[PDB]
């Protein structure tokens, strides 16, 4: 008795094949008789319609580019007191002793983060990195520090 009253007042039969629009348009080769209706809709919608940007592609350059090729060379200047502070902080982070809280690979890490953060590593940083990696027996990491210095 509760099912006999609730009929289909919600759905409708689907579109047949080669059907037309409710406005009269159709998918033919000649589209001069068909019109667009985007200018009749409201200009701005609060939210997102189910047909809003449903098929939107981007350029081929975005998926054919290599890594780190979009970064432009920016000259980030700063105060010389900030230069002294950051150089002393990087020199203190490189020279950390290898205990149970610091692995020797961090001596290679804090040099690399020095170049990612757009600082020029001075010679004392390379000296400290090579001596800290030599004191821990990491000779290949010291040669990696030398190759980092050569590639700069």
């Amino acid at each position: 008795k509760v099912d006999s009253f609730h009929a289909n007042t919600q759905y409708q039969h689907a579109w047949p094949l080669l059907s037309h629009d409710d406005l009269g348009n159709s998918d033919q080769s000649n589209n001069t008789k068909n019109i667009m209706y985007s200018m009749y809709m409201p200009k701005r919608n609060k939210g997102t319609a189910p047909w809003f940007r449903g098929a939107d592609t981007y350029s081929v350059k975005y998926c054919e580019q290599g890594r780190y090729e979009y970064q432009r060379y920016l000259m980030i200047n700063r105060f010389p007191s900030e230069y002294k502070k950051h150089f002393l902080s990087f020199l203190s982070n490189i020279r950390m002793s290898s205990g149970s809280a610091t692995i020797p690979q961090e001596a290679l890490h804090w040099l690399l983060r020095m170049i990612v953060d757009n600082f020029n590593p001075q010679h004392v940083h390379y000296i400290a990195a090579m001596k800290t990696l030599q004191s821990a027996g990491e000779l290949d990491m010291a040669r990696d520090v030398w190759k980092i210095m050569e590639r700069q």
Partner: peptide
Amino acid sequence: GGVPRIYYAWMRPGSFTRRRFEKMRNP
């Protein structure tokens, strides 16, 4: 007001919906 936003496309003379309306109001 009482008219919708699709009114000028629905009642445009020469269109399918306008010709259907003219055939409905005058058979």
